[PDB]
Every structure is written in C-alpha cells, then in structure tokens.
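Holo prediction — zinc ion.
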Amino acid sequence: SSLAISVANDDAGIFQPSLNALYGHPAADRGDYTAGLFLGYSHDLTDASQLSFHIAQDIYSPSGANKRKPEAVKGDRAFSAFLHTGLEWNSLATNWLRYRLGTDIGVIGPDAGGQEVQNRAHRIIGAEKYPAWQDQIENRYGYTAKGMVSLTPAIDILGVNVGFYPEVSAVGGNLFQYLGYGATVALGNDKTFNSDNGFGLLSRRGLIHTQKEGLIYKVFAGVERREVDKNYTLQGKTLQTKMETVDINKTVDEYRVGATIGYSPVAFSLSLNKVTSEFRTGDDYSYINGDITFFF
Ligand SMILES: CCCCCCCCCCOCCOCCOCCOCCOCCO
Ligand SMILES: [Zn+2]
Ligand SMILES: [Zn+2]
Ligand SMILES: [Zn+2]
Ligand SMILES: [Zn+2]
Ligand SMILES: [Zn+2]
C-alpha cells in the first residue's frame, strides 16, 4: 500500500534549470497548467492488484501578459479548475501485461474552487490576484472513465531491472475524451514498480505499486501521443464574456522524465513534464510534479 501527496507547479523552483535544459525556455514561459494538488491511497488486494482512491484539484491559466487582464482573452485559455475524486483498479494481468480501469466524478467551473485556492496562495505570498478569474470557464459536472493497457517486457541485469512499456490509454465522458498511445522506458530495482507508468489523466501522481522493501529506485523517460476529442477546460464557455476562447489541437504529445528514490517507508519522486500545444494559438508548456509517497 501507498499513501501519496503530489504537488504540480509550472514554477519548478530549484528544478527550473533542469526543466529548461530538457524542454527549452519557451515552454517555461507558458503557464497553461499552473497548479496541481493530489492526495491518494493505494491498497494491494493481492501482490498483483491495487485499488486506489484519490482527491485532486488542478488549475489552468492564460499565459504571460494575459494573466493580468480583466477578462479571458480570445486566443488563449481562460482561467479554469478541475476538482475530482475517483477510484481505480491497477493490475498485472500477467508478467507481460499491466492494465488499469478507473472512474472519476468531478467538476470544471467556479465550483472546482480555482479562484479561491489561487487567490489564497497569492495573498499569503503577497502576490496580486488575477482578476480574470471572474471570467473563468462555467460549471460542468461530470465523470471520466479511464483505461490503460501496457505490455511489460523487461530484463534483469545484476539486480537492475530495465524495461520498455508500450501502452494504449483511453478517457471518455463529458469533461475529457481522448485515445492515447505511447511508451515509457525505465530502469530500477523493482520489476513491478518499473511498469507502473502513465500520462495525462492516467498519470500515477505519486501512487506506487511495488513489491520492494528497503531501497527503492526508478528512473524513467516516456512520451504519449493523444488524439483529443474533448477538453472542457478549452471548449467550455466563459462566465462573463460567454465565449469559447480557443480552437483545440486534436493531436497532443506528453513527455515525462523523472525518478523515484526511497527507503521503506518513504519515497520521493520528481517528474519533468512537457505537454505540446493544446490549441492552435497556444504553445508547448512545461511543468514539474514532486511527490512524497509512504509505502508499506
Ligand atoms: C489476453 C488479451 C491480450 C491483450 C493484448 C493487449 C496488448 C495491448 C498493448 C498495446 O500497446 C501498443 C501501443 O504501441 C504504441 C507505441 O507507440 C509509441 C509512439 O509514441 C508517439 C510519440 O510521439 C512523439 C513523436 O515524436
Ligand atoms: Zn499494502
Ligand atoms: Zn523564454
Ligand atoms: Zn502556476
Ligand atoms: Zn493497504
Ligand atoms: Zn481524478
């Protein structure tokens, strides 16, 4: 079992030079995904299978000078937030297959609490608040249905497991809908943990599926291409200007490079991430997540 806290930020702090070297500086100049908070619990029903629960809030933002304007700007994403909770099954079907199946309920809109959380954060640090929260994406309550399958060929070399994990993912519902395909490569001291990967709404955000006690470590790099049918954060209508602000791009790539290091019962993770332009007038953006996972 693992209990995890994960924080995502486009401001990568001491990891900014690494993020910039990896994905280039223009991606850091964008601000599309501005904050994430996630708390999750995974329980092993067997050595092969987990059931996970989580609650999370993700906050999305216009970029650059648009952040300070009174309302949403045509051509850039509006302020929005996605507040969600759900359950997921994560299982090794065999030594060569991992699958995941999950359902969220949530909301994108003022009810997701993005203005409240960001305004609070800003007040606490003495930053000014961004007024265009008044023109945020309007409420839509909904569900996500999520699935992933991954092949898991890996070989063990002197206690180091190295693997290649081609995967297909799918999300549906009235908030987000896409079909993704990708692969991750990983090296680490645990076969099960090495195959436990994911992108986008299938990202594990700190949750760990592992057999290992004592030292745990993993280093990984992956990309997933998704074909996007829906993204309500982009296609929804703003509260006051009543517009859809952008034309979504139907093909979106997500890159993730990261690592975990831990010792029973605590592990630390960092993931350096890039998402390619999600709309015609946007551009690629980079961010990190840092996770603390108690695993026992
Ligand atoms: C008992 C039933 C058996 C079920 C079999 C299920 C197998 C499913 C596994 C499918 O995985 C294949 C997916 O392959 C995708 C790999 O593609 C990677 C390319 O990613 C695009 C990267 O974009 C970057 C472009 O520069
Ligand atoms: Zn357990
Ligand atoms: Zn720049
Ligand atoms: Zn931010
Ligand atoms: Zn448990
Ligand atoms: Zn969720």
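READOUT: Helices lie at 16-23, 25-29, 114-125, 191-194, 232-235.
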